[PDB]
Design a protein around this motif. Structure first.
Motif, short mmCIF file in Angstrom:
data_model
loop_
_atom_site.label_atom_id
_atom_site.label_comp_id
_atom_site.label_asym_id
_atom_site.label_seq_id
_atom_site.Cartn_x
_atom_site.Cartn_y
_atom_site.Cartn_z
N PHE B 70 -52.61 62.71 62.61
CA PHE B 70 -53.78 61.47 62.89
C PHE B 70 -52.69 60.96 61.08
N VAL B 71 -52.54 61.10 59.55
CA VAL B 71 -52.66 60.00 59.35
C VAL B 71 -51.12 59.99 59.39
N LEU B 72 -49.63 61.47 59.55
CA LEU B 72 -48.42 60.82 59.48
C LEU B 72 -48.13 59.80 60.77
N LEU B 73 -48.86 60.28 61.63
CA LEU B 73 -48.76 59.19 63.30
C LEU B 73 -49.23 58.27 62.82
N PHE B 74 -50.24 57.22 61.93
CA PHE B 74 -50.81 56.57 61.90
C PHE B 74 -50.46 55.77 61.31
N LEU B 75 -49.38 56.57 60.28
CA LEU B 75 -48.64 55.64 58.85
C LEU B 75 -47.39 55.58 59.18
N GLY B 76 -46.41 57.36 59.95
CA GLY B 76 -45.59 56.85 60.03
C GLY B 76 -44.85 55.56 61.67
N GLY B 77 -45.93 55.07 61.46
CA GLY B 77 -45.98 54.13 62.92
C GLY B 77 -46.19 52.67 62.33
N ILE B 78 -46.86 52.42 61.71
CA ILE B 78 -46.79 51.27 61.08
C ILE B 78 -45.43 50.88 59.74
N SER B 79 -44.91 51.75 59.20
CA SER B 79 -44.55 51.86 58.46
C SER B 79 -43.04 51.46 59.07
N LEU B 80 -42.63 52.16 60.43
CA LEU B 80 -41.86 51.98 61.06
C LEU B 80 -41.44 51.03 61.94
N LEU B 81 -43.35 50.27 62.09
CA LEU B 81 -42.52 48.71 62.56
C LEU B 81 -43.12 47.50 61.87
N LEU B 82 -42.85 48.00 60.40
CA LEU B 82 -42.60 46.70 59.22
C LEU B 82 -40.95 47.06 58.79
N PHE B 83 -40.58 48.41 59.19
CA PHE B 83 -39.39 49.00 59.10
C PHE B 83 -38.31 48.37 60.15
N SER B 84 -38.96 48.32 60.87
CA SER B 84 -38.04 47.40 62.05
C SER B 84 -38.32 45.70 62.40
N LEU B 85 -39.54 45.08 62.76
CA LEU B 85 -40.40 43.86 62.28
C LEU B 85 -38.70 43.34 60.91
N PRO B 86 -38.53 41.46 61.17
CA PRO B 86 -37.48 41.72 60.17
C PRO B 86 -37.08 41.43 58.67
N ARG B 87 -38.02 40.48 58.28
CA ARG B 87 -38.49 40.61 56.82
C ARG B 87 -39.61 39.35 57.45
N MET B 88 -40.35 39.77 56.25
CA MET B 88 -40.99 38.22 55.44
C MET B 88 -40.16 36.94 54.74
N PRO B 89 -40.06 35.86 55.52
CA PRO B 89 -38.44 35.17 55.62
C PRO B 89 -38.11 34.77 53.84
#
Ligand SMILES: CCCCCCCCCCCCCCCCCC(=O)OC[C@H](COP(=O)([O-])OCC[N+](C)(C)C)OC(=O)CCCCCCCCCCCCCCCCC
Ligand SMILES: CCCCCCCCCCCCCCCCCC(=O)OC[C@H](COP(=O)(O)OCCN)OC(=O)CCCCCCCCCCCCCCCCC
Ligand SMILES: CCCCCCCCCCCCCCCCCC(=O)OC[C@H](COP(=O)(O)OCCN)OC(=O)CCCCCCCCCCCCCCCCC
Ligand SMILES: CCCCCCCCCCCCCCCCCC(=O)OC[C@H](COP(=O)(O)OCCN)OC(=O)CCCCCCCCCCCCCCCCC
Ligand SMILES: CCCCCCCCCCCCCCCCCC(=O)OC[C@H](COP(=O)(O)OCCN)OC(=O)CCCCCCCCCCCCCCCCC
Ligand SMILES: CCCCCCCCCCCCCCCCCC(=O)OC[C@H](COP(=O)(O)OCCN)OC(=O)CCCCCCCCCCCCCCCCC
Ligand SMILES: CCCCCCCCCCCCCCCCCC(=O)OC[C@H](COP(=O)(O)OCCN)OC(=O)CCCCCCCCCCCCCCCCC
Ligand SMILES: *[C@@H]1O[C@H](CO)[C@@H](O[C@@H]2O[C@H](CO)[C@@H](O[C@@H]3O[C@H](CO)[C@@H](O)[C@H](O)[C@@H]3O)[C@H](O)[C@H]2NC(C)=O)[C@H](O)[C@H]1NC(C)=O
Ligand SMILES: COC(=O)C1=C(C)NC(C)=C(C(=O)OC)C1c1ccccc1[N+](=O)[O-]
Ligand SMILES: *[C@@H]1O[C@H](CO)[C@@H](O)[C@H](O)[C@H]1NC(C)=O
Ligand SMILES: [Ca+2]
Ligand SMILES: [Ca+2]
Lengths: 1274, 100, 97
Positions: B70-89
C-alpha cells in the motif's frame, strides 16, 4: 440658480433656514437618540420598568423631528424630478428609509392596541455618519479596498463547500450515541467533562464509568448545534473550525465516535489550508493595495507635506533656541552647575534613581512583611525630594522658558507636583478611603520616566504623534460599529437568556455596558461560539428559525474583522513607511554633515568531502531522529525501549567515526558536533542530559547550505527588532503594575459562593446535580485561589501575557469584575467598570503594538529588496516585461486533421460545451448537498440512480476528449490528468457500491473532488493560487525551521510530560496527551492556534498524578508533572509566533510584483493573451509564422498592447512597417522578436539609430540572453 | 481483483511510455498505481472486519507485507505523478503544458 | 436568584412593617432562610416573660431515632444575660433554643 424648474419663493426660503446650526442641532438630536437607545433596558416576557415607558414617549418626539426635516428637504429642493436625483444620493435614501421605516412601525403599533419591527430603530446611529463628512471619506476607503479581496472571498466560499460536503459524507449521523446511566435518561459525565459521544463495539470511546450504558437517541454534542448531518449544520461547523475557535472539540468529538486514526487529517488539513494559507493570501493582497495607495499619494504631492513641516519645526526650535539663550543670557557658580548637568556623568546618574523606583514598584506584593512596607515609604519620601531637586535645579539652571519646551520636561513638572500632592493629602488626615488607593495610583507614573531613555523609536513615536488626527478617525468608525452591533444584540438577545439552569451565562446582552463587552469578545475571537450557542438556545433550538440567529453572529465576526485590518494594518503599513523613509532621509541628512568637518592526510579528506559520503551521513541523521521519536515515555522496561537503545549504540559510534576523521584533516558550528557524540556515550544527572540528546537533528542544518543560510537570516531578524521587543516589555510592566494595585488579594474564592472568607470556608457543603434540589452530594469546601492572579508583579505579567494571546481573557475579565475586597470572596457584578483596564490593554498591546511589529518586519524586508539599487536606463516595469520577452516560449494547441476528428474537435472546444459541462458539475454539487440523515428510502435509491447517471456522463466527456485530441495531446494538459483520475476513481466506486448489494467511504470522495475542476475556468482565482503555491514551494527552508522547531519541542515534551495520567476531566486526556510523538506534535499544533494553551500549561505543572503503567515507589503517586512547563510553554508560544510572522512576510515578499502590480497599465496578463492568439496561428511552435496572418494578429489584441477600438487602416497599417521588425523570408517572422517591438512600442519607445542601444541595455542589467537576442537585436 | 488488475493495466501504460518518445502516456500510469494502492487499503480494511467479528488476532507475514505495498504503491504513484507533471510554473512568463 | 434588579424598595417594605429581609441566590440557601422567620415571630413571646413558658405537646410523629410513634413536650429557653441590671437586650430578644 440652474433650478431647471420650481414653484416660487412663497415658502422656499427653506434654503435660507439651513445655514450653520441646523446642521448641528440635528446632529445633536441624533446623539440624544443614541443615548435613548442605550439607556433602554430589555426585560423578559413583556415586563417593563417605568423608565422604559418614558422612553417610548421620547421615541415619538424623535420620530417627528427626523420626520419634518425629511419633508423640509422635499420642499427646499424642488419637484419630483429632484426627488429622483436625490435618490441617486446615498445619504438621502438612508435618512429617508430610517424615518419612513420609523413611522411605519409606530402606526402598526398604535393601531394594534411589532417587537421585531422595533429592531430597525437601531439603524439610527448610521444617520450620524451622514452628518460628518470627515467620516464619510473613511467609509469609502474601507469599501474601495474590497474589490481586490473578491478573488479571495470567492475562494473561501468554495473551500467551505468542499469540506462541508466531504465532512458530511465522512461523519454523517455518527455522533448520536452518548453515555447514559442504565435505565435512565440522565447523561453520565465526569465533573469537568462536557458530554461527548460513545461507541458500542467500534473504535470509539467506550463507557468507562461505573454505571452507564451507551445508547443512541442523543441529539448531539453542543445541544445538537454541532455535527455534520445535513448541509446547513455541516457548513456552520466547518466555518467555525476555520476561525480556529473550537476546532479541536469537533476533532475530539469525531474521534470519539468514529475512531482515532483517520479524522486528524480532515481537520489538520482544513486548518492549515483553510486558515493559514488563506490568511496569508488576504494579508498579502491587502498590503499590496496599501503600497499602491501610498504610491498614488507620495508621487502626487504628499511627501513634501511631511518633510517641510518636520524641517520647519526643527528649524523653529533651532530659531527659538537662539532666542531663549539670548534673552536668558546671575552667579557664575550656577552656570558651572548647568555645565556639569549637561555633562554625561549626570546621564548615568539619572538612571540610578530611576532604577531605585522600578525596584520599589515591583516590590509590592500581597501579604508582604512589615519591614518591606515601611522601606517603600522611606524610599518614596527620599526619591520625591530627589525628584524635587532635579526639577528645581534643571528649571533654574538652564532657564525657566526652555524647560517648558521638552516633551519630557513637561512631565517632570507633573511628577513632583502630584508627588507632593499625595504627601499633602494623606498627611492632613484626608486619605479618603478610595483616594488612599486613587492617589497611590499616580506614583505608578514614575516608571514612565524611562520613556525618554530610548532615543531609538524617537523617530517613530514622533511620526505617530503627528498622525493622531489620522489615528483617531478610523478608530472612531470602529467604535460606531461596536455600538450598532451592541444595540442589535440587545434587540435579538436582550432578556432572552431566561434559562432555568443553575449555570452562569455571563457574557450576555442585557445592559448596554454588558452588550458592548460581549460584542468586543466576539471581535477578539475569544470563545465567540459559546456566546452563539446561548443565542441559538434563547430562540428555539437547532430548528428552522432558531438557527437563523447564527447569521447575525457570523456578520459581526467577518465584517468587523475587516475593519480591524484596515485600521491597524493601515496604520502599520503607512506610518511605518514614513518613519522609515524619514529614517533614510535623516540618514542622507546624517553622513553628509560628517563629511563636512572631515573635508595519510589526503585520502581521508577526499572520502569525507565525497558527495556520496554526505548522503550516507544525512540518512543516519534521518535514522537517529526517528529513534528519538519512537521512544516510549511511561515504561522504561519495555522491549521497545530496550531495542531502541541498541539503535542508540549503533549510530553514535558512527558519528564518532565522523568526528575523529574530521580532526585528522583539519586542526563555531563544530563545537556542536563534538557535544552530541559525547552525550550519548555518557548517557549509555542523567535525566537532564537526555533532553540535551534531541539536538542531534539541529546539527543537520550545517549539512545543508540552505539550512546554514536561513538560521543566519532568522538571527538577523532579531537585530533590528529588539527595540520593539524592549518597548513592549516595558509596557507589559506598566500594566502589570497597575493590575497589581487593583487586583491584589482579590482573586480568592470559596468553593461555595456563600461563604465569603477563609475562616468561614471550612467544612462540607452540598452540591446539586443538574439543578435538581432533590439530588445532592456532599463535597468538602476549600478556599481556592485562581490560577492566574495579580498578586506580585511577576504573577501579574504572566496573566497579561495570557491575555495578549486572547486565550482565557474573558475568564480573567469576569474574575476582575467580581472582585470584592482585600481578602474576601467575590460579589456578582461588583465593579463592571474594570473592563476598561483589560480592553485598553488589548487595544494597546494585542491590537496596536503587535501590528507595528508585523508592519516592521515588512518594511525592513522591503528594503532588503530595495537596498540593492538598480539605477539603469530601464525601470521596474521593463525588467518584468523585457526579460519575459527574452525568455518566452510558445504554447501548443494541436489542431488535428482527418476532418472526422476535426468534427469532434470543434464540438469539444466550443463555448457551449464548457457551458454544458460547467453546468453539470453545478448539478452534481446540489445532488451531493441534498444528502441528510434519516432521509427516506426513495431518497436513498435515487441518490444511487443519480450518482451512476453522473458517472456515465463524465465518462463520455472523457472519450470525446481522447478521440479528438489524439491522446498524446490529451495528457499534455495537467487538467486532463486530474480529470482522468476523478473519472476512474468514481467508476470503481460505482462498482464497489453495487457489488456491495449484489452479494469504502474513501472512494465516495471521488465524487466531490470533481468540483476542483471549476478552477480551470476562473482565471483570476488560479493566478492567485499559483502565485503563492509557487512561492511556498520555492521557499521550503522557511517552513523547515518551523518543522524543526516542532520536532525539537515534541521530543522534549514526551520526556518531561510523558508520565501524567490520562484522567478525563483534565486537559491531559485520551485526545490531548504527550505519550507518543504523533500525539505530542498534535498537542503542539493545538498551541500554535492557541486553543486552551494556558490550560495545558496548568495541567502539567508538578502536582499531576502518574499513570499506573509507569513505575514509582508507592505513596508517591502524585509526584509527576514539572514546573519547567511555564518556561517551555511560554517559549514555544513565542518562538512559534515569531517563525510564523517570519514565514508570512517571507512569502508576501516573493510575490511583491503580483501584489503591487496595478493592473491598469501593463502586466504579463497581456503577454499571456498574445500567445493564446498566437496559438491559433501555431499548431506547434516552429518559431515563425506567415506574414499574411501578422495583420490578423493585431486585430485580436487589446489596445493597451496593440491597436485600438478604431479601424486599423491608418495607425495599424503605418506603424507596423515603420516600427522595427526583423525581415526574414516572406512568410517567416519569428515569435521571439515580433513580441519585442510590439512591446517596445507600447512602452520604452525609442528613436532610430539607437536600435542597438536597446540591445545594448539587454545584455548588462538583463539576465543572460543565451544568444537568443541576435534576432531580438535586429 | 481490482487492485491486481488496475496494476496490470497501469503497467501497459508504463511499459509503452518508455518507447516511441511519448511521455504524456506515463501520466495515466501514475494514476493506476494510486488506485492500485488504494484498492489494497480497502482490502486491508475489509480483512480487519473479518478478524474483528471472529480467540485473538495477530498478523505477521502478509498484512505488513501489503501495508508495505500500500504505502509503496500509494506513494510511489503520487510522487511519479509530480515527477511527471511539468512543474509549478515559478515565473510569470511560464505556463503548464509549455512548449517542449 | 442572581439578578440586577433593585433591592432597596423591598428592603424598605420589610423595614417599614417590622418583618425581615432574606436573600436566596441558590438552592443550598433555601433551607436556612425559609426557616429563619421564626426568629422574628418569637420576639413577642420572649418579651412575655414567664407567661410564655408553657409546655405544649406535639402531634404524634415518627421519632428521628426510630423509637416509634411519639409526642414531644416543648418549652422555649430564653437568652437572659445581665437581667439583674437590664444592661443589653440587643440579642436578648431571641430564644436560646
Ligand atoms: C488519505 C487517507 C484517507 C482515508 C479515509 C478513510 O479511511 O476513511 C474512513 C473513516 C471512516 O471511519 P469508520 O469506517 O471506522 O466509521 C466509524 C463508524 N463508527 C463510528 C460507528 C465506528 O473516515 C473517517 O473517520 C475520517 C477520515 C478523514 C479522511 C480525510 C480525507 C479528506 C480530507 C482532505 C480533503 C482535501 C480537500 C482539499 C481541498
Ligand atoms: C452613542 C453614545 C452612547 C452613550 C450611552 C450612555 O451614555 O448610557 C447612559 C446610561 C445611563 O443609564 P442610567 O444610569 O439608568 O441613567 C438613565 C437616566 N436616568 O448608562 C448605561 O446604561 C451604560 C453606558 C455605558 C457607556 C459606555 C461609553 C464608552 C463606550
Ligand atoms: C430583525 C429582528 C426581528 C425579531 C422578530 C422576533 O423576535 O420573532 C421571534 C421569532 C422567534 O421564534 P423561535 O425561533 O421559534 O423562538 C421563539 C421561542 N421558542 O423569531 C424567529 O423565529 C427567528 C428569527 C431569526 C432572524 C435572524 C435575524 C438576524 C439577522
Ligand atoms: C452560502 C451558505 C448557504 C447555506 C444554505 C443551507 O444551509 O441550506 C441547507 C440545506 C439543507 O437541506 P437538506 O440537505 O435537504 O436537508 C433538510 C434537513 N435534513 O441544504 C440543501 O438543501 C442542499 C444545498 C446544496 C447546495 C450546494 C452548493 C454547492 C454549489
Ligand atoms: C496611571 C494610573 C491610573 C490609576 C487610576 C486609578 O487611580 O484607579 C483607582 C480606581 C480604584 O478602583 P477600585 O480599586 O475598584 O476601588 C474603588 C473603591 N470604591 O480604579 C477604578 O475605579 C477603575 C479604573 C480603571 C483602570 C483603567 C486602567 C487603564 C489605565 C491606562 C493608562
Ligand atoms: C522565554 C522564557 C520565559 C520564562 C517564563 C517563566 O519562567 O515564568 C514563570 C513565572 C511564574 O509566575 P506565576 O504565574 O506566579 O506562577 C507561579 C509558579 N511558578 O511567570 C513569569 O514570571 C512570567 C514572565 C513571562 C512574561 C511574558 C511577557 C514578556 C515576555 C518577554 C520574553
Ligand atoms: C494530481 C494530478 C494533478 C493535479 C493538478 C492538475 C492541474 C494543474 O496542475 O493545473 C495547474 C494550475 C494552472 O496551471 P497552468 O494552466 O499551466 O498555468 C500556469 C501559468 N504559469 O495551477 C494551479 O494548480 C493553481 C492552484 C490549483 C490547486 C488545485 C489543487 C488540486 C488538487 C487537490
Ligand atoms: C445571648 O445574648 C448575648 C448578648 O445579650 C449574646 O452575647 C454576645 O455575643 C456576641 C456574639 O457575636 C458577642 O460579640 C462578639 O464580641 C467579641 C469580643 O469578645 C468580638 O470579637 C466579636 O466580633 C463579636 O462582636 C458579645 O460579646 C456578646 N455580648 C455580651 C453582652 O456578652 C449571646 O450570643 C446570646 N446567646 C447565644 C447563645 O447566642
Ligand atoms: C510575538 O511574540 C508574542 O507572541 C507576544 C504575544 C502574543 N503576547 C505578549 C503580551 C507579548 C509581549 O508583551 O512581549 C513582552 C509577545 C510579544 C509581542 C510583540 C513583540 C514582542 C513580544 N515578546 O516579547 O514576546
Ligand atoms: C464500580 O461499581 C461497582 C458496582 O457498584 C462496584 O462494585 C465497584 O467497587 C466500583 N469500582 C470499584 C473500583 O470499586
Ligand atoms: Ca482565538
Ligand atoms: Ca480560543
Amino acid at each position: 440658480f440652474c433650478l431647471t424648474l420650481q414653484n416660487p419663493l412663497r415658502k422656499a426660503c427653506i434654503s435660507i433656514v439651513e445655514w450653520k446650526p441646523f446642521e448641528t442641532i440635528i446632529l445633536l438630536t441624533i446623539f440624544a437618540n443614541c443615548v435613548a437607545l442605550a439607556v433602554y433596558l430589555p426585560m423578559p416576557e413583556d415586563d417593563n420598568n417605568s423608565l422604559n415607558l418614558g422612553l417610548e414617549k421620547l421615541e415619538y418626539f424623535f420620530l417627528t423631528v427626523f420626520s419634518i426635516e425629511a419633508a423640509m428637504k422635499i420642499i427646499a429642493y424642488g419637484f419630483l424630478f429632484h426627488q429622483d436625483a436625490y435618490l441617486r444620493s446615498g445619504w438621502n435614501v438612508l435618512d429617508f428609509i430610517i424615518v419612513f421605516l420609523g413611522v411605519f412601525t409606530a402606526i402598526l403599533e398604535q393601531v394594534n392596541v411589532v417587537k421585531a419591527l422595533r429592531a430597525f430603530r437601531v439603524l439610527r446611529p448610521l444617520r450620524l455618519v451622514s452628518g460628518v463628512p470627515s467620516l464619510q471619506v473613511v467609509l469609502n476607503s474601507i469599501f474601495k479596498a474590497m474589490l481586490p479581496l473578491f478573488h479571495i472571498a470567492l475562494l473561501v466560499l468554495f473551500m467551505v463547500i468542499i469540506y462541508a460536503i466531504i465532512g458530511l459524507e465522512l461523519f454523517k449521523g455518527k455522533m448520536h450515541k452518548t453515555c447514559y446511566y442504565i435505565g435512565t435518561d440522565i447523561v453520565a459525565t465526569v465533573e469537568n467533562e462536557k458530554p461527548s459521544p460513545c461507541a458500542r463495539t467500534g473504535s470509539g470511546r467506550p463507557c468507562t464509568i461505573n454505571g452507564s450504558e451507551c445508547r443512541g437517541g442523543w441529539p448531539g454534542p453542543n445541544h445538537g448545534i454541532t455535527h455534520f448531518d445535513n448541509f446547513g449544520f455541516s457548513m456552520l461547523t466547518v466555518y467555525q473550525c476555520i476561525t480556529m475557535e473550537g476546532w479541536t472539540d469537533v476533532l475530539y468529538w469525531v474521534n470519539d465516535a468514529i475512531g482515532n486514526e483517520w479524522p486528524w487529517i480532515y481537520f489538520v488539513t482544513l486548518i492549515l489550508l483553510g486558515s493559514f494559507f488563506i490568511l496569508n493570501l488576504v494579508l498579502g493582497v491587502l498590503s499590496g493595495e496599501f503600497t499602491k495607495e501610498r504610491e498614488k499619494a507620495k508621487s502626487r504631492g504628499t511627501f513634501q507635506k511631511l518633510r517641510e513641516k518636520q524641517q520647519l519645526e526643527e528649524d523653529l526650535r533651532g530659531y527659538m533656541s537662539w532666542i531663549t539663550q539670548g534673552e536668558v543670557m546671575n552667579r557664575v557658580f550656577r552656570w558651572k552647575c548647568h555645565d556639569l548637568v549637561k555633562s554625561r556623568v549626570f546621564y548615568w546618574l539619572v538612571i540610578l534613581i530611576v532604577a531605585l523606583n522600578t525596584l520599589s514598584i515591583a516590590s509590592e506584593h500581597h501579604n508582604q512583611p512589615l519591614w518591606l512596607t515601611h522601606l517603600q515609604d522611606i524610599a518614596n519620601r527620599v526619591l520625591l525630594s530627589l525628584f524635587t531637586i532635579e526639577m528645581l535645579l534643571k528649571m533654574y539652571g538652564l532657564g525657566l522658558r526652555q524647560y517648558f519646551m521638552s516633551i519630557f520636561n513637561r512631565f517632570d513638572c507633573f511628577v513632583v507636583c502630584s508627588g507632593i500632592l499625595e504627601l499633602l493629602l494623606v498627611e492632613s488626615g484626608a486619605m479618603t478611603p478610595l483616594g488612599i488607593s486613587v492617589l497611590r495610583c499616580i506614583r505608578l507614573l514614575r516608571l514612565f520616566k524611562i520613556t525618554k531613555y530610548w532615543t531609538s523609536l524617537s523617530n517613530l513615536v514622533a511620526s505617530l504623534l503627528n498622525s493622531i488626527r489620522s489615528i483617531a478617525s478610523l478608530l472612531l468608525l470602529l467604535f460606531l460599529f461596536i455600538i450598532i452591533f451592541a444595540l442589535l444584540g440587545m434587540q435579538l438577545f436582550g432578556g432572552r437568556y431566561d434559562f432555568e439552569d443553575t449555570e452562569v451565562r455571563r457574557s450576555n446582552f442585557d445592559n448596554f455596558p454588558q452588550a458592548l463587552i460581549s460584542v468586543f469578545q466576539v471581535l477578539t475571537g475569544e470563545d465567540w461560539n459559546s456566546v452563539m450557542y446561548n443565542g441559538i438556545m434563547a430562540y428555539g433550538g437547532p430548528s428552522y428559525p432558531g438557527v437563523l440567529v447564527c447569521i447575525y453572529f457570523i456578520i459581526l465576526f467577518v465584517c468587523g474583522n475587516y475593519i480591524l485590518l484596515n485600521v491597524f494594518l493601515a496604520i502599520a503599513v503607512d506610518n511605518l513607511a514614513e518613519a522609515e523613509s524619514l529614517t533614510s532621509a535623516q540618514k542622507a541628512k546624517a553622513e553628509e554633515r560628517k563629511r563636512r568637518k572631515m573635508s595519510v592526510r589526503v585520502l581521508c579528506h577526499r572520502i569525507v568531502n565525497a558527495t556520496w559520503f554526505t548522503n550516507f551521513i544525512l540518512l543516519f541523521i534521518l535514522l537517529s531522529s526517528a529513534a528519538l521519536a519512537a521512544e516510549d515515555p511511561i515504561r522504561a522496561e519495555s522491549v521497545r525501549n530496550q531495542i531502541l537503545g541498541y539503535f542508540d549504540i549503533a549510530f553514535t559510534s558512527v558519528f564518532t567515526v565522523e568526528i575523529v576523521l574530521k580532526m585528522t584533516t583539519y586542526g563555531y558550528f563544530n563545537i556542536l558536533d563534538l557535544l552530541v557524540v559525547a552525550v550519548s556515550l555518557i548517557s549509555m544527572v542523567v535525566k537532564i542530559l537526555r533532553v540535551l540528546r534531541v539536538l542531534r537533528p539541529l546539527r543537520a542544518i550545517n549539512r545543508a547550505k540552505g539550512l546554514k543560510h536561513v538560521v543566519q537570516c532568522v538571527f538577523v531578524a532579531i537585530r533590528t527588532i529588539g527595540n520593539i521587543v524592549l518597548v513592549t516589555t516595558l509596557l507589559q510592566f506598566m500594566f502589570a503594575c497597575i493590575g497589581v494595585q487593583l487586583f491584589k488579594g482579590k482573586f480568592f474564592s470559596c468553593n461555595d459562593l456563600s461563604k465569603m472568607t477563609e475562616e468561614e470556608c471550612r467544612g462540607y457543603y452540598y452540591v446539586y446535580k443538574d439543578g435538581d434540589p432533590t439530588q445532592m452530594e456532599l463535597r468538602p469546601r476549600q478556599w481556592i485561589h485562581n490560577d492566574f492572579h495579580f498578586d506580585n508583579v511577576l504573577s501579574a505579567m504572566m496573566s497579561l501575557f495570557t491575555v495578549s494571546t486572547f486565550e482565557g481573557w474573558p475568564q480573567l475579565l469576569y474574575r476582575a469584575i467580581d472582585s470584592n475586597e482585600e481578602d474576601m470572596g467575590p460579589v456578582y457584578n461588583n465593579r463592571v467598570e474594570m473592563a476598561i483596564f483589560f480592553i485598553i490593554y488589548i487595544i494597546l498591546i494585542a491590537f496596536f503594538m503587535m501590528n507595528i511589529f508585523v508592519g516592521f518586519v515588512i518594511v525592513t524586508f522591503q528594503e532588503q529588496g530595495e537596498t540593492e539599487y538598480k539605477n539603469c536606463e530601464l525601470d521596474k516595469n521593463q525588467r518584468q516585461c523585457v526579460q519575459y520577452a527574452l525568455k518566452a516560449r510558445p504554447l501548443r494547441c494541436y489542431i488535428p486533421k482527418n476532418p472526422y476528428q476535426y468534427q469532434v474537435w470543434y464540438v469539444v472546444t466550443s463555448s457551449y460545451f464548457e457551458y454544458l459541462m460547467f453546468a453539470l458539475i453545478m448539478l452534481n454539487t446540489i445532488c451531493l448537498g441534498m444528502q441528510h440523515y434519516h432521509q427516506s428510502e426513495e431518497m436513498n435509491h435515487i441518490s444511487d440512480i443519480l450518482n451512476v447517471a453522473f458517472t456515465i456522463i463524465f465518462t463520455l466527456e472523457m472519450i470525446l476528449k481522447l478521440l479528438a485530441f489524439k491522446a498524446r495531446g490529451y495528457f499534455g494538459d495537467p487538467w486532463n490528468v486530474f480529470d482522468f483520475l476523478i473519472v476512474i476513481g468514481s467508476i470503481i466506486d460505482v462498482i464497489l457500491s453495487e457489488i456491495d448489494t449484489f452479494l469504502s467511504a474513501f472512494f465516495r470522495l471521488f465524487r466531490v473532488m470533481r468540483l476542483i475542476k471549476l478552477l480551470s475556468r476562473a482565471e483570476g482565482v488560479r493566478t492567485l493560487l499559483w502565485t503563492f503555491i509557487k512561492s511556498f514551494q520555492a521557499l521550503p527552508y522557511v517552513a523547515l525551521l518551523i518543522v524543526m522547531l516542532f520536532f525539537i519541542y515534541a521530543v522534549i515534551g514526551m520526556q518531561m510530560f510523558g508520565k501524567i495520567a490520562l484522567v478525563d476531566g483534565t486537559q491531559i486526556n485520551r485526545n490531548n496527551n504527550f505519550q507518543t510523538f504523533p500525539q505530542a506534535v498534535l498537542l503542539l499544533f493545538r498551541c500554535a492556534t492557541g486553543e486552551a494553551w494556558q490550560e495545558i500549561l496548568l495541567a502539567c505543572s508538578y502536582g499531576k498524578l502518574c499513570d499506573p503503567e509507569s513505575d514509582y515507589a508507592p505513596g508517591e503517586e502524585y509526584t509527576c508533572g514539572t514546573n519547567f512547563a511555564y518556561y517551555y510553554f511560554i517559549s514555544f508560544y513565542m518562538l512559534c509566533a515569531f517563525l510564523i510572522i517570519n514565514l508570512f512576510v517571507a512569502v508576501i515578499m516573493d510575490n511583491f510584483d503580483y501584489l503591487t502590480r496595478d493592473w491598469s497599465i501593463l502586466g504579463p496578463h497581456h503577454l499571456d493573451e498574445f500567445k493564446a492568439i498566437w496559438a491559433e496561428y501555431d499548431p506547434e511552435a516552429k518559431g515563425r509564422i506567415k506574414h499574411l496572418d501578422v495583420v490578423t494578429l493585431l486585430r485580436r489584441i487589446q489596445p493597451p498592447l496593440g491597436f485600438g477600438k478604431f479601424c486599423p487602416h491608418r495607425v495599424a497599417c503605418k506603424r507596423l512597417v515603420g516600427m522595427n521588425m526583423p525581415l526574414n523570408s516572406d512568410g517567416t517572422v519569428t515569435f521571439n522578436a515580433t513580441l519585442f517591438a510590439l512591446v517596445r512600442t507600447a512602452l520604452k519607445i525609442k528613436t532610430e539609430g539607437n536600435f542597438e542601444q536597446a540591445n545594448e541595455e539587454l545584455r548588462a542589467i538583463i539576465k543572460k540572453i543565451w544568444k537568443r537576442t541576435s534576432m531580438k537585436l535586429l | 481483483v481490482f487492485s491486481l488488475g488496475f496494476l496490470i493495466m497501469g503497467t501497459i501504460c508504463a511499459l509503452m511510455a518508455f518507447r516511441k518518445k511519448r511521455d504524456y502516456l506515463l501520466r495515466p500510469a501514475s494514476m493506476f498505481y494510486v488506485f492500485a494502492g488504494l484498492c489494497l487499503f480497502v482490502s486491508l480494511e475489509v480483512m480487519r472486519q473479518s478478524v474483528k467479528r471472529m480467540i485473538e488476532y495477530y498478523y505477521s507475514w502478509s498484512f505488513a507485507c501489503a501495508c508495505a505495498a500500500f504505502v509503496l504503491l500509494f506513494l510511489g504513484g503520487i510522487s511519479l505523478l509530480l515527477f511527471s507533471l511539468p512543474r509549478m510554473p515559478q515565473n510569470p512568463w511560464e505556463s503548464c503544458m509549455d512548449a517542449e | 436568584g442572581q439578578h440586577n434588579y433593585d433591592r432597596g424598595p423591598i428592603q424598605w417594605m420589610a423595614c417599614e412593617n417590622k418583618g425581615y429581609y432574606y436573600e436566596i441566590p441558590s438552592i443550598g440557601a433555601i433551607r436556612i432562610n425559609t426557616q429563619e422567620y421564626l426568629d422574628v415571630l418569637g420576639r413577642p413571646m420572649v418579651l412575655a416573660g414567664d407567661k410564655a413558658k408553657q409546655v405544649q405537646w406535639t402531634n404524634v410523629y415518627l421519632d428521628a431515632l426510630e423509637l416509634g410513634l411519639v409526642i414531644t413536650g416543648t418549652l422555649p429557653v430564653f437568652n437572659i444575660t445581665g437581667q439583674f441590671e437590664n444592661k443589653t437586650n440587643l440579642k436578648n430578644q431571641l430564644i436560646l433554643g
